[PDB]
């Protein structure tokens with residue numbers, strides 16, 4: 326399991342938590358020195374438990390699929406909550422079994438459905454460590470509309486920060502003041518699968534992407550990524566989604 330406490334958190338402690346979340350995910354090999362997530366994990370071992378504590382010390386436990394860093398559901402006190410989708414229904418066979426009841430949220434866990442339920446796109450929702458405190462608070466007691474926005478904050482401050490060093494650094498900048506995500510943050514979040522695929526294909530193509538990937542950089546400009554010497558490959562991406570998924 327991994328844990329993070331908002332009480333006493335600072336950029337260093339968050340950075341160390343994200344390093345620890347990455348290290349909790351299994352891999353058999355690295356590609357261009359980036360861990361390659363596994364194609365598949367059978368049964369309960371597929372799920373990592375992430376214990377999150379708000380400023381006031383109240384907690385939720387979040388279930389994360391270790392093959393794709395996808396948040397499936399969470400436990401708050403005696404109630405489990407799962408996204409309305411088959412992978413999350415499967416997870417509910419393995420995690421939080423001792424909850425007194427299980428609620429299926431009235432949306433899947435993809436960005437498209439969460440943004441419709443929240444009534445706002447990611448671009449308009451401030452993120453940061455205060456926002457994560459608020460999100461844990463919101464998720465402690467059921468509210469499906471408020472929960473959708475809380476889950477967008479939770480996903481971006483945990484899973485997306487694990488996937489990209491840049492996004493970790495953006496949340497560190499927001500340790501004490503929330504701010505809507507940068508243009509590059511949205512671009513990277515949207516591109517993880519594509520980048521993963523191209524970096525794995527590059528291993529048999531002399532480091533060259535078979536299909537260049539368009540990103541927004543840290544200055545807000547559009548750039549074309551063509552090969553593994555790009556800083557997005559050498560410094561930024563931290564985990565690769567296996568091409569088998």
Ligand SMILES: *[C@@H]1O[C@H](CO)[C@@H](O)[C@H](O)[C@H]1NC(C)=O
Nearest residue numbers: 549550551552553554555556
């Ligand atoms: C490979 O990527 C590097 C770093 O972004 C870039 O400078 C270079 O132009 C790329 N090479 C080709 C042939 O696209």
Ligand SMILES: Nc1ncnc2[nH]cnc12
Nearest residue numbers: 394395396434435436484
């Ligand atoms: N539920 C989720 N978990 C992790 N990353 C996601 N990206 C969009 N939805 C996600």
